[model samples]
Target: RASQQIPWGIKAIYNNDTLTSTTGGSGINIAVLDTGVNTSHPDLVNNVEQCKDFTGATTPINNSCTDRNGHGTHVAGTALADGGSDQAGIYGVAPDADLWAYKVLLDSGSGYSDDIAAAIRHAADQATATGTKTIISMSLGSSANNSLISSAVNYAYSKGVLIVAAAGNSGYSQGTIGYPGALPNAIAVAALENVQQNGTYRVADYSSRGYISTAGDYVIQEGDIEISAPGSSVYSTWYNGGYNTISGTSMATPHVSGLAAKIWAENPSLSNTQLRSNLQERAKSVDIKGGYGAAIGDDYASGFGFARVQ
Candidate 1:
């Protein structure tokens, strides 16, 4: 039986406006590029498939595309948590959504840019072969820009893959969001906190912000944000058959990713640009009047505003 205690982030978005049309993400595949996921988890066992390791780590964990580090498992759970005896029911935004694990980061939580870019293209190529609308969810990044990574993002976008990336965790500055997220065709997601403005979500301090397009940048030079979601103290599944709460734009990213799966499943005919516009249009506005790029809506801290996945 599913537990009655829904995650606060889900409640925050869905309690007010809910999706009654679908569950289990219907007809979509979300490619999770992280340290990989623990497919042994009861809630995730059936939903996760197409596992591959790009990190080149030889440990048993990396060899099997399983998450030795807990971050990937946690993010996977948030995107596709279908509760089992060990945890609360359906903690994820797209609980029944199908997942593909592309292990890009290693057990030590580090990876090369080339591997990551290759994984992105691999996912794109897989989607083209499968003829399915795939969503690429990357919750990892660095401040430095990568030309190869940027090219790969453009390649995936050209092929109808919707790439969603975290805005990085560098929250203290204005130009910290980077990499694939900064790619023009990619959807850059910021982190929102539990705090709200009359039921609308606000931006978290640790979420990166940027209008910064440094030298030699092309498509990724723009600072236009796609959306934001809960990132603070977010609870989800963990590695080693456990559960944990963590915080980061990494935590926030899967919410949008899961939502994208759901949205795409329901509206399969929508183009990538149209689907992205749908998400931006559905966002709820929050107040950021205390300064720091404050305006009536769409602040640098929180893109179109807090996500309304429901």
Candidate 2:
């Protein structure tokens, strides 16, 4: 049986009993644009709203959103796993949030930028067509920028969809933040790891860092890290109805995505821009001393600090 307690990542972001008790992202939708999701996973079945494939794989299953590689499944679990009907499985940050499983990447966990762009557009269109609040969560990225992806991100943003992506796993080297994440319209997320397994977190070494334009200007800029969240050794639902522990900035992206969903659910009147600002305002800076990890206010390593619900 799965643990009855909330996952450490969820707790770290303050998405525990107090927040979930009132709203678990009900009526909000999170589009997981990755390899795909295991739609049949007990923890994810009820929340999967739709599934589609843009990878053009020869053999498509589960509406082309089946997870041959475990990346997408893991990412989906973190964003909005519902812990199953019996409450015996794990819970994600926004357990009640609906999931739109868009398979933009192939089974190999990689795909063309054009396909990803198309998927992003589709998610945005669907949200508008159905009149539902949507947030797009992408755990995939590329070092080089693609015009197609940039246009799609802009389109989604114009359509009132919030885009969240991983800040790449490249070390502290400057200019390592990946595309899409590096896009100005997207919220690039940095990875944070547990310091003592209690509640404290610090920026992970592998989490990509960005450049600082001015000393104390908290305003966001292109190629800047927008936020931070738990990513190292995060445990969540996996493919084949199982669970796994993985580490990467990819894992951190969804925590923010899920938090956006939860906040949007609570404040139904807030637009996408308002919701984004709310997240930035609610983010609390990590208390790490030295210039190593997240610092007070906005910096290169962790933008605005870690996002929290309360």
Q: Of the candidates shown, which would achieve the greatest lDDT relative to the real structure?
A: 2
Worst 10 residues of 2 by lDDT: 284-293
For residue 19, model 2's alpha carbon misses the true position, in angstroms, by 9.3
List candidate 2 stretches off by more than 4 Å: 3-5, 15-23, 57-62, 196-200, 284-293
lDDT of 2: 0.83
State residue 310's C-alpha deviation in candidate 1, in Å: 4.7
Could you say which candidate leads in TM-score?
2
Q: Candidate 1 at 226: error in angstroms?
A: 2.2
Model 1 regions more than 4 Å off: 1-5, 16-22, 57-63, 85-89, 197-199, 212-221, 284-292
- The CA lDDT of each predicted structure is 0.75, 0.83
Instruction: Single out the weakest 10-residue window by summed lDDT for candidate 1.
Output: 212-221
lDDT of 2 by residue, 217-278 (tens): 75677888887889998998877778888999999999999999999999878988899888
Model 1 pairs in collision: none
Per-residue lDDT over 38-154 for candidate 1, one digit per residue giving the tens place of the 0 to 100 score = 888887886876788887654222336778999999898888877754554446777767889889997887888888898899889988999888999999888887988889998
